[PDB]
Design a protein around this ligand. Structure first.
Ligand code: J7F
Ligand code: J7F
Lengths: 463, 464
């Protein structure tokens, strides 16, 4: 199974010998240091339940870690005594307190999102031990934040080229299962995406949400039948029409997506879809459109040339603001080379050519869930308050060659002014008083406050 | 973990899209045509952890059926096809996977492994497990990128010192905090350990021990080290007391002490170079003090650190004409190091005549996170199908991108008479004009038939 004593950076194993004498408390916090001006806080509850809560220390896990580290360091520097103390005194529960803003809250950059401190003075070293596991919440935060920014771009352009926001939550579809680094990442990232949208093909995201968050809806995300290259090319290069015909007929009463660029996307749209199989498309209902999927070439140019061909083979209308609109049984999804930058280029290029955003949805894979780093939001975990010799000092780092790697001081609290802006109070000044938005979510091995996925989606809504 | 829930959603509907009477779906993985050769590593982890043994149960089938009912707002899940696997093969996957030995260094554009169904009723299963198998792009890319950095380090360590001693400890993995999940950390750190032995990502140690095994006591090593929180906890006026306490607590092993908490150029010239000078020269060369700057421009900072340190400690010229610190004193640059910044630093030290013996490097998110599937163009494609007794060679050929063209027919990898590699298509490998097929069966009907030790993988991935 998973062993928390082997779930930290190696140098942190030796930290219990590096503090000043008689150190009783280490206090640390997470923030997205100072374009992404506001971030969605999401993912901590998953980490608390899966890795931190309950009996996480056992006699076998202590023996396992001791053997590994003895060889790893070529020396005895494992704190077997202190880990036995946790096992004996607390039945293997972590004497730790965590306070956090509610999940789904949208918070401007440079504010405390959660804090970590030891509740037993013998475990002063435990705060920075679990930094490694906790700081990985940068990923769901960054995915949920970058996904929400793409929802602003879509909502803005879907509103000027159409006048409404119908189907907005299905306009950016998670295709990223293949392009992420692991099954666990797929689950975490896909659930972070579902904070803002409801279309996904990464099934692991559905499983994570039901197990760790829960929803009133029958399922957190939805998809539609779709073809890949292997289901088309299997019919033979001369039988692409047959492959198309078999697939739209199998799924004639539900939406179906057909990748149409196996050999020539423009021929498939002009000759195959626009003539040979046109009778099978114009007969489809509004609730069961065909979605044509280009998957190669330049993303914007191919989208423009595909829409041009479909426009001169199917009845185009002009909507309430002067933008062109395919018939309700035909749609397009661009799911190749889509990230937040290219997505902006596609929708602007379409608006420039007077096409409505209603005609198109987007699929993002490695760009939505993989090509993201801790430096995008400058997610940072710092120690700000220690107590040595019964004397608490506000600690901080302040490099001379980089003032941007600075950190806050002392005990922190997150507050909201009467005007509404957010402010992080340092040096314990939060005791002088609204009130603190950091609620306790973990204490001494138990999760003390939970949020459902519906509550998270409500907090992360746009204005 | 539920294999029936571990695939792209639309793959649930593909058993109804293949041509009728399709009895075989045959698919292959390649890194489609810097990064001219790839290290093949990571498939066995996926096989052992997710694919082998009884992976289909009545519980997992019911769980998947109810999920997909609501996910698609319709019943399309192939519950009969999954029941057949549970009933006939006791939940063992009827799949055969042939792959090149892990650790092999293969040029781009070659078949790395192939997947086919062994039961005609399970034609749909081959590309069902595409999603889980294609994620091997990540360990492949990390191992390849790590090894390309090893070439750079080896080329310059030889020009400046004459040997390659300690090469496998010159690029240290600090990526645990910067990646996206615990599993990703383990996978990524093990790929680094294919070429090096130094890591702080403990999850990689456990992943290797559980899924590959080694004859060594531990797959990776590290040393005690201080972070900013253990230095600042003494207060700004007591940075000296922290340094002396830590160096004394770890005098028989190497120790790394971060020095840019307050003022790094004050850290080397003043506190190390004078106040605690007497505690640094007095340590063995097997247990030196490692100075770590972690801010500022990487190349400029390390250069100004080496020069300041020379003004305070005896620097000798090595047999090649390059400056070399006393062996009780080393430097590690682990801030913002990737394959690009590494090259300009090492020659930036060589053109400024500093020996690469002095320096080690650490890499975090640049080593394990800022990597995507299209860096090596890792792709999984169907190349051969059998329909109504007729074998057919299959491929894609998009008009706007000839680079996305896929191979045709049954594939094989061969050693050429000149000692290189070539991939044969359309079954021509059966002629064996060159060698035997280099693809060995590693998975068949739920069993791992060929397993590799991590010691074998490291041997296959060595330089030269
Ligand atoms: C038709 C639905 C999804 C209800 C819809 C409703 C409102 C607005 C847009 C919509 O379609 C977006 C789309 O194209 N999704 C899609 C999903 C998977 C896939 O493989 C191809 C495409
Ligand atoms: C035995 C050692 C000292 C690893 C060694 C042996 C041979 C050659 C070079 C070496 O040092 C590389 C290094 O700096 N490793 C390092 C590890 C962790 C850390 O936090 C800081 C640094």
């Amino acid at each position: 199974e998973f062993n928390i004593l082997l779930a930290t950076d190696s140098y942190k194993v030796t930290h219990y010998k590096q503090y000043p004498p008689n150190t009783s408390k280490v206090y640390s916090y997470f923030e997205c240091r100072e374009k992404y001006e506001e971030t969605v806080f999401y993912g901590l509850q998953y980490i608390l339940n899966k890795y931190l809560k309950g009996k996480v220390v056992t006699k076998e896990k202590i023996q396992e870690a001791k053997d590994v580290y003895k060889e790893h360091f070529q020396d005895d520097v494992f704190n077997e005594k202190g880990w036995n103390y946790i096992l004996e005194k607390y039945d293997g529960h972590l004497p730790i307190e965590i306070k956090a803003v509610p999940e789904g809250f949208v918070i401007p950059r440079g504010n405390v999102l959660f804090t970590v401190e030891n509740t037993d003075p013998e475990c002063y070293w435990l705060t920075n031990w679990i930094e490694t596991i906790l700081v990985q919440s940068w990923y769901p935060i960054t995915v949920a934040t970058n996904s929400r920014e793409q929802k602003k771009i879509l909502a803005k352009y879907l509103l000027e080229t159409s006048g409404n926001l119908d189907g907005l939550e299905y306009k950016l579809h998670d295709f990223g299962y293949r392009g992420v680094s692991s099954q666990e990442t797929a689950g975490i990232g896909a659930s972070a995406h579902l904070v803002n949208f409801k279309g996904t093909d990464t099934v692991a995201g559905l499983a994570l949400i039901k197990k760790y968050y829960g929803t009133k809806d029958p399922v957190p995300g939805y998809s539609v039948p779709a073809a890949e290259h292997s289901t088309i090319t299997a019919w033979g290069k001369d039988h692409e029409k047959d492959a198309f015909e078999h697939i739209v007929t199998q799924f004639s009463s539900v939406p179906v997506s057909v990748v149409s660029d196996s050999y020539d996307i423009y021929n498939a749209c002009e000759k195959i879809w626009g003539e040979d199989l046109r009778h099978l498309i114009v007969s489809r209902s509004t609730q069961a459109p065909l979605i044509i999927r280009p998957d190669s070439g330049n993303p914007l140019d191919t989208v423009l040339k595909v829409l041009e061909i479909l426009g001169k083979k199917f009845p185009v209308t002009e909507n309430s603001k002067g933008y062109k609109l395919l018939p309700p049984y035909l749609r397009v999804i661009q799911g190749d080379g889509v990230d937040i930058n290219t997505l902006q280029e596609i929708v602007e290029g379409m608006k420039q050519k007077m096409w409505s955003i209603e005609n198109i949805a987007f699929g993002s894979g490695g760009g939505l869930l993989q090509k993201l780093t801790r430096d995008l939001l400058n997610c940072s975990f710092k120690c700000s308050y220690v107590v040595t010799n019964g004397l608490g000092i506000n600690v901080f780092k302040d490099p001379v060659a980089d003032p941007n790697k600075r950190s806050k001081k002392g005990r922190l609290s997150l507050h909201r002014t009467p005007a509404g802006n957010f402010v992080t109070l340092e040096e314990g000044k939060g005791d002088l008083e609204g009130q603190d938005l950091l609620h306790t979510v973990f204490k001494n091995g138990k999760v003390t406050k939970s949020y459902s996925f519906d509550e998270i989606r409500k907090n992360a809504q746009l204005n």
